[PDB]
Amino acid sequence: GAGSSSLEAVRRKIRSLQEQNYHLENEVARLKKLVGER
Amino acid sequence: GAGSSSLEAVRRKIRSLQEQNYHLENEVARLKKLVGER
């Protein structure tokens, strides 16, 4: 460890990144689904 | 702690994660604009 604020910062950043990962995945999926073939 | 075991292992991953999703986001940006601005 290191600190509560530090661990929160790192954890929440990488966890939000993972959220962005799955979100962007589905986001662009619907995106290319819409423009690709309707 | 904070040895070579920690440095490269974590750094490599988080480096690539950023790079990967960066390109993805950039793709999404133009794509969503393309389908929106029709």
Side-chain angles (χ1 to χ4, degrees):
Chain A
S4 189
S5 43
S6 184
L7 188 58
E8 277 297 288
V10 179
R11 176 186 297 154
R12 193 165 304 268
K13 184 64 63 176
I14 57 90
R15 193 179 71 159
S16 191
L17 180 64
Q18 297 177 31
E19 175 169 60
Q20 183 185 30
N21 277 212
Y22 296 103
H23 184 88
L24 189 157
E25 193 189 288
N26 287 271
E27 196 72 271
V28 68
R30 172 174 52 219
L31 203 174
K32 60 182 178 178
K33 211 61 172 179
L34 177 63
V35 64
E37 190 58 76
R38 204 61 193 106
Chain B
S4 45
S5 309
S6 311
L7 297 178
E8 181 172 60
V10 181
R11 187 275 170 153
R12 167 62 194 189
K13 299 187 65 182
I14 56 89
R15 197 293 310 236
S16 305
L17 296 178
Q18 296 176 90
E19 185 266 279
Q20 175 66 90
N21 289 270
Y22 181 76
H23 282 109
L24 298 178
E25 183 183 275
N26 283 208
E27 180 183 89
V28 177
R30 272 300 181 152
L31 265 58
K32 59 88 181 183
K33 176 178 176 56
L34 183 65
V35 62
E37 183 176 54
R38 199 183 189 240

Coordinates of all heavy atoms in Angstrom, one line a residue:
Chain A
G1 N 0.8 -1.2 0.0 CA 0.0 0.0 0.0 C 0.8 1.3 0.0 O 2.0 1.2 -0.4
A2 N 0.3 2.4 0.4 CA 0.9 3.6 0.5 C 0.1 4.7 1.2 O 0.6 5.3 2.2 CB 1.2 4.2 -1.0
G3 N -1.1 4.8 0.9 CA -2.0 5.7 1.5 C -3.5 5.5 1.0 O -3.7 4.9 0.0
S4 N -4.4 6.0 1.8 CA -5.8 5.8 1.5 C -6.2 6.6 0.2 O -6.8 6.1 -0.7 CB -6.7 6.2 2.7 OG -8.1 5.8 2.4
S5 N -5.8 7.9 0.2 CA -6.0 8.8 -0.9 C -5.3 8.3 -2.1 O -5.8 8.3 -3.2 CB -5.5 10.2 -0.5 OG -4.3 10.1 0.1
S6 N -4.1 7.8 -1.9 CA -3.3 7.3 -3.1 C -3.9 6.0 -3.6 O -4.0 5.9 -4.9 CB -1.9 7.0 -2.6 OG -1.0 6.6 -3.6
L7 N -4.3 5.1 -2.8 CA -5.0 3.9 -3.2 C -6.3 4.1 -3.9 O -6.6 3.5 -4.9 CB -5.1 2.9 -2.0 CG -5.6 1.5 -2.4 CD1 -4.6 0.8 -3.4 CD2 -5.7 0.6 -1.1
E8 N -7.1 5.0 -3.3 CA -8.3 5.5 -3.9 C -8.1 6.0 -5.3 O -8.8 5.6 -6.3 CB -9.0 6.5 -3.1 CG -9.8 5.9 -1.9 CD -11.0 5.0 -2.4 OE1 -12.0 5.6 -2.9 OE2 -10.9 3.8 -2.3
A9 N -7.1 6.9 -5.4 CA -6.8 7.5 -6.7 C -6.5 6.5 -7.8 O -7.1 6.4 -8.8 CB -5.6 8.5 -6.6
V10 N -5.5 5.6 -7.4 CA -5.1 4.6 -8.4 C -6.2 3.6 -8.7 O -6.5 3.3 -9.9 CB -3.9 3.8 -7.8 CG1 -3.4 2.7 -8.8 CG2 -2.7 4.7 -7.5
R11 N -6.8 3.1 -7.6 CA -7.9 2.1 -7.8 C -9.0 2.6 -8.6 O -9.5 2.0 -9.6 CB -8.4 1.6 -6.5 CG -9.6 0.6 -6.6 CD -10.1 0.3 -5.2 NE -9.2 -0.4 -4.4 CZ -9.2 -0.4 -3.0 NH1 -10.1 0.3 -2.4 NH2 -8.3 -1.1 -2.3
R12 N -9.5 3.8 -8.2 CA -10.7 4.4 -8.9 C -10.4 4.8 -10.3 O -11.2 4.7 -11.2 CB -11.2 5.6 -8.1 CG -12.6 6.1 -8.5 CD -13.1 7.0 -7.5 NE -13.2 6.4 -6.1 CZ -14.2 5.8 -5.7 NH1 -15.3 5.6 -6.4 NH2 -14.2 5.2 -4.4
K13 N -9.1 5.1 -10.6 CA -8.7 5.5 -11.9 C -8.7 4.2 -12.8 O -9.3 4.3 -13.9 CB -7.3 6.1 -11.9 CG -6.8 6.6 -13.3 CD -7.7 7.7 -13.8 CE -7.6 8.9 -12.9 NZ -8.4 10.1 -13.5
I14 N -8.1 3.2 -12.4 CA -8.0 2.0 -13.2 C -9.3 1.2 -13.3 O -9.6 0.6 -14.3 CB -6.9 1.0 -12.7 CG1 -7.1 0.6 -11.2 CG2 -5.5 1.7 -12.9 CD1 -7.9 -0.7 -11.1
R15 N -10.2 1.4 -12.3 CA -11.5 0.8 -12.3 C -12.4 1.5 -13.2 O -13.2 0.9 -13.9 CB -12.1 0.8 -10.8 CG -13.3 -0.1 -10.7 CD -13.9 -0.1 -9.3 NE -14.5 1.2 -8.9 CZ -15.4 1.3 -8.0 NH1 -15.7 0.3 -7.2 NH2 -15.9 2.5 -7.7
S16 N -12.3 2.9 -13.2 CA -13.0 3.7 -14.2 C -12.6 3.4 -15.6 O -13.3 3.4 -16.5 CB -12.9 5.2 -13.8 OG -13.8 6.0 -14.5
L17 N -11.3 3.2 -15.7 CA -10.7 2.8 -17.0 C -11.3 1.5 -17.5 O -11.7 1.4 -18.7 CB -9.2 2.6 -16.9 CG -8.4 2.2 -18.2 CD1 -8.6 3.3 -19.2 CD2 -7.0 1.9 -17.9
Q18 N -11.5 0.5 -16.6 CA -12.1 -0.7 -17.0 C -13.6 -0.5 -17.4 O -14.1 -1.1 -18.3 CB -12.0 -1.7 -15.8 CG -10.6 -2.1 -15.5 CD -10.5 -3.1 -14.3 OE1 -11.4 -3.9 -14.1 NE2 -9.4 -3.0 -13.6
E19 N -14.2 0.4 -16.7 CA -15.6 0.8 -17.0 C -15.6 1.4 -18.4 O -16.5 1.0 -19.2 CB -16.1 1.8 -16.0 CG -17.5 2.3 -16.3 CD -18.1 3.1 -15.2 OE1 -17.6 4.1 -14.7 OE2 -19.2 2.7 -14.7
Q20 N -14.7 2.3 -18.7 CA -14.6 2.9 -20.0 C -14.3 1.9 -21.0 O -14.9 2.0 -22.1 CB -13.4 3.9 -20.0 CG -13.2 4.7 -21.3 CD -12.0 5.6 -21.3 OE1 -11.0 5.3 -20.6 NE2 -12.0 6.7 -22.0
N21 N -13.5 0.9 -20.7 CA -13.2 -0.2 -21.6 C -14.5 -0.9 -22.1 O -14.7 -1.0 -23.3 CB -12.3 -1.3 -20.9 CG -10.8 -0.9 -21.0 OD1 -10.0 -1.8 -21.0 ND2 -10.5 0.4 -20.9
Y22 N -15.3 -1.4 -21.2 CA -16.5 -2.2 -21.5 C -17.5 -1.2 -22.1 O -18.3 -1.6 -23.0 CB -17.0 -2.9 -20.3 CG -16.1 -4.0 -19.8 CD1 -15.4 -3.8 -18.6 CD2 -16.0 -5.2 -20.4 CE1 -14.5 -4.8 -18.2 CE2 -15.2 -6.2 -20.0 CZ -14.5 -6.0 -18.8 OH -13.6 -7.0 -18.4
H23 N -17.6 0.0 -21.6 CA -18.5 1.0 -22.1 C -18.2 1.4 -23.5 O -19.1 1.3 -24.4 CB -18.5 2.3 -21.2 CG -19.5 3.3 -21.6 ND1 -20.8 3.3 -21.1 CD2 -19.5 4.3 -22.5 CE1 -21.5 4.3 -21.7 NE2 -20.7 4.9 -22.6
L24 N -17.0 1.7 -23.8 CA -16.6 2.1 -25.1 C -16.8 0.9 -26.1 O -17.3 1.1 -27.2 CB -15.1 2.5 -25.1 CG -14.5 3.1 -26.4 CD1 -13.3 4.0 -26.1 CD2 -14.2 2.1 -27.4
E25 N -16.5 -0.3 -25.7 CA -16.7 -1.5 -26.5 C -18.2 -1.6 -26.9 O -18.4 -1.7 -28.1 CB -16.4 -2.7 -25.6 CG -16.2 -4.0 -26.4 CD -16.1 -5.2 -25.6 OE1 -15.0 -5.4 -24.9 OE2 -17.1 -6.0 -25.5
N26 N -19.1 -1.5 -26.0 CA -20.5 -1.5 -26.4 C -21.0 -0.3 -27.1 O -21.9 -0.3 -27.9 CB -21.4 -1.8 -25.1 CG -21.3 -3.2 -24.6 OD1 -22.0 -4.1 -25.0 ND2 -20.3 -3.4 -23.6
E27 N -20.4 0.8 -26.7 CA -20.7 2.1 -27.3 C -20.4 2.1 -28.8 O -21.2 2.4 -29.7 CB -19.9 3.3 -26.7 CG -20.4 4.6 -27.0 CD -21.7 4.9 -26.2 OE1 -22.8 4.6 -26.8 OE2 -21.7 5.5 -25.1
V28 N -19.2 1.7 -29.2 CA -18.7 1.6 -30.6 C -19.4 0.5 -31.3 O -19.7 0.5 -32.5 CB -17.2 1.5 -30.7 CG1 -16.7 0.1 -30.2 CG2 -16.8 1.7 -32.2
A29 N -19.8 -0.6 -30.5 CA -20.6 -1.7 -31.1 C -21.9 -1.2 -31.6 O -22.3 -1.5 -32.8 CB -20.8 -2.8 -30.1
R30 N -22.6 -0.5 -30.8 CA -23.9 0.1 -31.2 C -23.7 1.2 -32.3 O -24.5 1.3 -33.2 CB -24.6 0.7 -30.0 CG -25.8 1.5 -30.3 CD -26.6 2.0 -29.1 NE -25.7 2.6 -28.1 CZ -25.7 2.5 -26.8 NH1 -26.6 1.6 -26.3 NH2 -24.9 3.1 -26.0
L31 N -22.6 1.9 -32.2 CA -22.2 2.9 -33.2 C -22.0 2.3 -34.6 O -22.7 2.7 -35.5 CB -20.8 3.5 -32.7 CG -20.5 4.9 -33.3 CD1 -19.2 5.4 -32.6 CD2 -20.4 4.9 -34.8
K32 N -21.2 1.3 -34.7 CA -20.9 0.7 -36.0 C -22.1 -0.2 -36.4 O -22.2 -0.5 -37.6 CB -19.6 -0.2 -36.0 CG -19.6 -1.3 -35.0 CD -18.3 -2.0 -35.0 CE -18.2 -3.1 -33.9 NZ -16.9 -3.8 -34.0
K33 N -22.9 -0.6 -35.5 CA -24.2 -1.3 -35.8 C -25.1 -0.4 -36.5 O -25.8 -0.7 -37.5 CB -24.8 -1.9 -34.6 CG -25.5 -3.2 -34.8 CD -24.6 -4.3 -35.3 CE -25.3 -5.6 -35.4 NZ -24.4 -6.7 -35.9
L34 N -25.2 0.9 -36.0 CA -26.1 1.9 -36.5 C -25.7 2.3 -37.9 O -26.6 2.4 -38.8 CB -26.1 3.1 -35.5 CG -27.0 4.3 -35.9 CD1 -28.5 3.9 -36.0 CD2 -26.8 5.4 -35.0
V35 N -24.5 2.7 -38.0 CA -24.0 3.3 -39.3 C -23.6 2.2 -40.3 O -23.7 2.4 -41.5 CB -22.8 4.2 -39.1 CG1 -21.6 3.4 -38.5 CG2 -22.4 4.9 -40.4
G36 N -23.3 1.0 -39.8 CA -22.8 -0.1 -40.7 C -24.0 -0.7 -41.4 O -24.0 -0.7 -42.6
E37 N -24.9 -1.3 -40.7 CA -26.1 -1.9 -41.3 C -27.3 -1.7 -40.5 O -27.4 -2.2 -39.3 CB -25.8 -3.4 -41.5 CG -26.8 -4.2 -42.3 CD -26.9 -3.6 -43.7 OE1 -26.0 -3.8 -44.5 OE2 -27.9 -2.9 -44.0
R38 N -28.3 -1.0 -41.0 CA -29.5 -0.7 -40.3 C -30.6 -1.6 -40.7 O -31.0 -1.6 -41.9 CB -29.9 0.8 -40.5 CG -30.7 1.4 -39.4 CD -29.9 1.4 -38.1 NE -30.7 1.7 -37.0 CZ -31.1 0.7 -36.1 NH1 -30.8 -0.5 -36.3 NH2 -31.8 1.1 -35.0
Chain B
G1 N 9.9 -3.5 -1.3 CA 8.8 -3.2 -2.2 C 9.3 -2.3 -3.3 O 10.4 -1.7 -3.2
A2 N 8.5 -2.1 -4.4 CA 8.8 -1.2 -5.5 C 10.0 -1.7 -6.3 O 10.7 -0.9 -6.8 CB 8.9 0.2 -5.0
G3 N 10.2 -3.0 -6.3 CA 11.3 -3.5 -7.1 C 11.0 -3.6 -8.5 O 10.0 -3.2 -9.0
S4 N 11.9 -4.3 -9.3 CA 11.8 -4.5 -10.7 C 10.6 -5.4 -11.0 O 10.0 -5.3 -12.1 CB 13.0 -5.0 -11.3 OG 13.5 -6.1 -10.5
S5 N 10.2 -6.2 -10.0 CA 9.0 -7.0 -10.2 C 7.8 -6.2 -10.3 O 6.8 -6.6 -11.0 CB 8.9 -7.9 -8.9 OG 10.2 -8.6 -8.7
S6 N 7.7 -5.1 -9.6 CA 6.6 -4.2 -9.6 C 6.6 -3.3 -10.8 O 5.6 -3.3 -11.5 CB 6.6 -3.4 -8.3 OG 6.8 -4.2 -7.1
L7 N 7.7 -2.6 -11.0 CA 7.8 -1.6 -12.1 C 7.3 -2.1 -13.4 O 6.2 -1.7 -13.8 CB 9.2 -1.1 -12.2 CG 9.8 -0.5 -10.9 CD1 11.3 -0.1 -11.2 CD2 9.0 0.7 -10.5
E8 N 8.0 -2.9 -14.1 CA 7.8 -3.2 -15.5 C 6.4 -3.9 -15.6 O 5.6 -3.6 -16.5 CB 8.9 -4.1 -16.1 CG 8.7 -4.4 -17.6 CD 9.9 -5.1 -18.2 OE1 10.3 -6.2 -17.7 OE2 10.4 -4.6 -19.2
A9 N 6.2 -4.9 -14.8 CA 5.0 -5.7 -14.8 C 3.7 -4.9 -14.9 O 2.9 -5.0 -15.8 CB 4.9 -6.6 -13.6
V10 N 3.6 -3.9 -14.0 CA 2.4 -3.1 -13.9 C 2.4 -2.1 -15.0 O 1.5 -1.9 -15.8 CB 2.3 -2.4 -12.6 CG1 1.0 -1.5 -12.5 CG2 2.3 -3.4 -11.4
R11 N 3.6 -1.4 -15.2 CA 3.8 -0.3 -16.1 C 3.4 -0.8 -17.5 O 2.6 -0.1 -18.2 CB 5.2 0.2 -16.1 CG 5.4 1.5 -16.9 CD 5.7 1.2 -18.3 NE 5.7 2.3 -19.2 CZ 6.4 2.4 -20.3 NH1 7.3 1.5 -20.6 NH2 6.3 3.5 -21.1
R12 N 3.9 -1.9 -18.0 CA 3.7 -2.4 -19.3 C 2.2 -2.5 -19.6 O 1.7 -2.0 -20.6 CB 4.4 -3.8 -19.5 CG 3.9 -4.6 -20.7 CD 4.3 -3.8 -22.0 NE 3.5 -4.4 -23.2 CZ 3.8 -4.0 -24.4 NH1 4.7 -3.2 -24.7 NH2 3.0 -4.6 -25.4
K13 N 1.5 -3.1 -18.6 CA 0.1 -3.3 -18.8 C -0.7 -2.0 -18.9 O -1.3 -1.8 -20.0 CB -0.5 -4.1 -17.6 CG 0.1 -5.5 -17.5 CD -0.6 -6.3 -16.4 CE -2.1 -6.6 -16.8 NZ -2.8 -7.4 -15.8
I14 N -0.5 -1.1 -18.0 CA -1.3 0.1 -17.9 C -0.9 1.0 -19.1 O -1.7 1.8 -19.6 CB -1.1 0.9 -16.6 CG1 0.4 1.1 -16.2 CG2 -1.8 0.1 -15.5 CD1 0.9 2.4 -16.8
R15 N 0.3 0.9 -19.6 CA 0.8 1.6 -20.8 C 0.0 1.2 -21.9 O -0.6 2.0 -22.6 CB 2.3 1.3 -21.0 CG 3.0 2.2 -21.9 CD 2.5 2.2 -23.4 NE 2.5 0.8 -23.9 CZ 3.1 0.4 -25.0 NH1 4.0 1.3 -25.6 NH2 3.0 -0.8 -25.5
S16 N -0.1 -0.1 -22.2 CA -0.8 -0.7 -23.4 C -2.3 -0.4 -23.3 O -2.9 0.0 -24.3 CB -0.5 -2.2 -23.5 OG 0.9 -2.4 -23.5
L17 N -2.8 -0.5 -22.1 CA -4.2 -0.3 -21.9 C -4.6 1.1 -22.4 O -5.6 1.3 -23.1 CB -4.6 -0.4 -20.4 CG -4.4 -1.8 -19.8 CD1 -4.7 -1.8 -18.3 CD2 -5.2 -2.8 -20.5
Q18 N -3.8 2.1 -22.0 CA -4.0 3.5 -22.4 C -4.0 3.6 -23.9 O -4.9 4.1 -24.5 CB -3.0 4.4 -21.7 CG -3.1 4.5 -20.2 CD -2.0 5.4 -19.6 OE1 -2.2 6.6 -19.4 NE2 -0.9 4.8 -19.3
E19 N -2.9 3.1 -24.5 CA -2.6 3.2 -25.9 C -3.8 2.5 -26.7 O -4.3 3.2 -27.6 CB -1.3 2.5 -26.2 CG -0.8 2.6 -27.6 CD -1.3 1.4 -28.5 OE1 -0.6 0.3 -28.4 OE2 -2.3 1.5 -29.2
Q20 N -4.2 1.3 -26.3 CA -5.2 0.6 -26.9 C -6.5 1.4 -27.0 O -7.0 1.7 -28.0 CB -5.5 -0.7 -26.2 CG -6.7 -1.5 -26.7 CD -6.5 -2.0 -28.1 OE1 -5.9 -3.1 -28.3 NE2 -6.8 -1.3 -29.1
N21 N -7.0 1.8 -25.8 CA -8.3 2.5 -25.7 C -8.2 3.9 -26.2 O -9.2 4.4 -26.7 CB -8.7 2.5 -24.2 CG -9.2 1.1 -23.7 OD1 -10.3 0.8 -23.9 ND2 -8.2 0.4 -23.2
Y22 N -7.0 4.5 -26.3 CA -6.8 5.8 -26.9 C -7.2 5.7 -28.3 O -8.0 6.5 -28.8 CB -5.4 6.2 -26.7 CG -5.1 7.6 -27.3 CD1 -5.5 8.7 -26.6 CD2 -4.4 7.7 -28.5 CE1 -5.2 10.0 -27.1 CE2 -4.1 9.0 -29.0 CZ -4.5 10.1 -28.3 OH -4.2 11.3 -28.8
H23 N -6.6 4.8 -29.0 CA -6.9 4.6 -30.4 C -8.4 4.3 -30.6 O -9.0 4.8 -31.5 CB -6.1 3.5 -31.0 CG -4.7 3.9 -31.3 ND1 -3.6 3.4 -30.6 CD2 -4.2 4.7 -32.3 CE1 -2.5 4.0 -31.1 NE2 -2.8 4.8 -32.1
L24 N -9.0 3.5 -29.8 CA -10.4 3.1 -29.8 C -11.2 4.3 -29.7 O -12.1 4.5 -30.5 CB -10.7 2.1 -28.7 CG -10.0 0.8 -28.8 CD1 -10.3 -0.1 -27.6 CD2 -10.2 0.1 -30.1
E25 N -10.9 5.2 -28.7 CA -11.7 6.4 -28.4 C -11.6 7.3 -29.7 O -12.6 7.8 -30.1 CB -11.2 7.1 -27.2 CG -12.0 8.3 -26.8 CD -11.4 9.1 -25.7 OE1 -11.7 8.7 -24.5 OE2 -10.6 10.0 -25.9
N26 N -10.4 7.4 -30.2 CA -10.2 8.3 -31.4 C -11.1 7.8 -32.5 O -11.7 8.6 -33.2 CB -8.7 8.3 -31.8 CG -7.9 9.2 -30.9 OD1 -6.9 9.7 -31.3 ND2 -8.3 9.3 -29.6
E27 N -11.1 6.5 -32.7 CA -11.9 5.9 -33.7 C -13.4 6.2 -33.5 O -14.0 6.7 -34.4 CB -11.7 4.3 -33.7 CG -12.6 3.6 -34.8 CD -12.4 2.1 -34.7 OE1 -13.2 1.5 -33.9 OE2 -11.5 1.6 -35.4
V28 N -13.9 6.0 -32.3 CA -15.2 6.2 -31.9 C -15.6 7.6 -32.2 O -16.7 7.9 -32.8 CB -15.5 5.9 -30.4 CG1 -16.9 6.3 -30.0 CG2 -15.2 4.5 -30.1
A29 N -14.8 8.6 -31.8 CA -15.0 10.0 -32.0 C -15.5 10.3 -33.4 O -16.6 10.8 -33.6 CB -13.8 10.8 -31.7
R30 N -14.6 10.0 -34.4 CA -14.9 10.3 -35.8 C -16.1 9.5 -36.3 O -17.0 10.0 -37.0 CB -13.7 10.0 -36.7 CG -12.8 11.2 -36.8 CD -13.6 12.4 -37.4 NE -12.7 13.6 -37.6 CZ -12.9 14.5 -38.5 NH1 -13.9 14.4 -39.3 NH2 -12.1 15.6 -38.6
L31 N -16.2 8.2 -35.8 CA -17.3 7.3 -36.2 C -18.6 7.9 -35.8 O -19.5 8.0 -36.6 CB -17.1 5.9 -35.7 CG -16.4 4.9 -36.6 CD1 -15.0 5.4 -37.1 CD2 -16.3 3.6 -36.0
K32 N -18.8 8.3 -34.5 CA -20.0 8.7 -34.0 C -20.4 10.1 -34.6 O -21.6 10.3 -34.8 CB -20.0 8.8 -32.5 CG -18.9 9.8 -31.9 CD -19.4 11.2 -31.8 CE -18.3 12.1 -31.2 NZ -18.8 13.5 -31.0
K33 N -19.4 10.8 -35.0 CA -19.6 12.1 -35.7 C -20.1 11.8 -37.1 O -21.0 12.5 -37.6 CB -18.4 13.0 -35.7 CG -18.5 14.3 -36.5 CD -17.3 15.1 -36.5 CE -17.4 16.3 -37.4 NZ -18.6 17.2 -37.0
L34 N -19.5 10.8 -37.8 CA -19.9 10.5 -39.1 C -21.3 10.0 -39.2 O -22.0 10.4 -40.2 CB -19.0 9.4 -39.6 CG -19.2 9.0 -41.1 CD1 -18.8 10.1 -42.0 CD2 -18.3 7.7 -41.4
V35 N -21.8 9.2 -38.3 CA -23.2 8.7 -38.3 C -24.2 9.8 -37.8 O -25.3 9.8 -38.3 CB -23.3 7.4 -37.5 CG1 -23.0 7.7 -36.0 CG2 -24.7 6.9 -37.6
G36 N -23.7 10.7 -37.0 CA -24.5 11.8 -36.5 C -24.7 12.8 -37.5 O -25.8 13.2 -37.9
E37 N -23.6 13.3 -38.0 CA -23.6 14.4 -39.1 C -23.7 13.7 -40.4 O -22.7 13.4 -41.1 CB -22.3 15.2 -39.0 CG -22.2 16.3 -40.0 CD -21.0 17.2 -39.8 OE1 -19.9 16.6 -39.8 OE2 -21.1 18.4 -39.6
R38 N -25.0 13.3 -40.7 CA -25.2 12.5 -41.9 C -25.7 13.5 -43.1 O -26.7 14.1 -42.9 CB -26.4 11.5 -41.6 CG -26.5 10.4 -42.6 CD -27.6 9.5 -42.3 NE -27.6 8.3 -43.1 CZ -28.6 7.9 -43.9 NH1 -29.6 8.7 -44.1 NH2 -28.6 6.7 -44.4

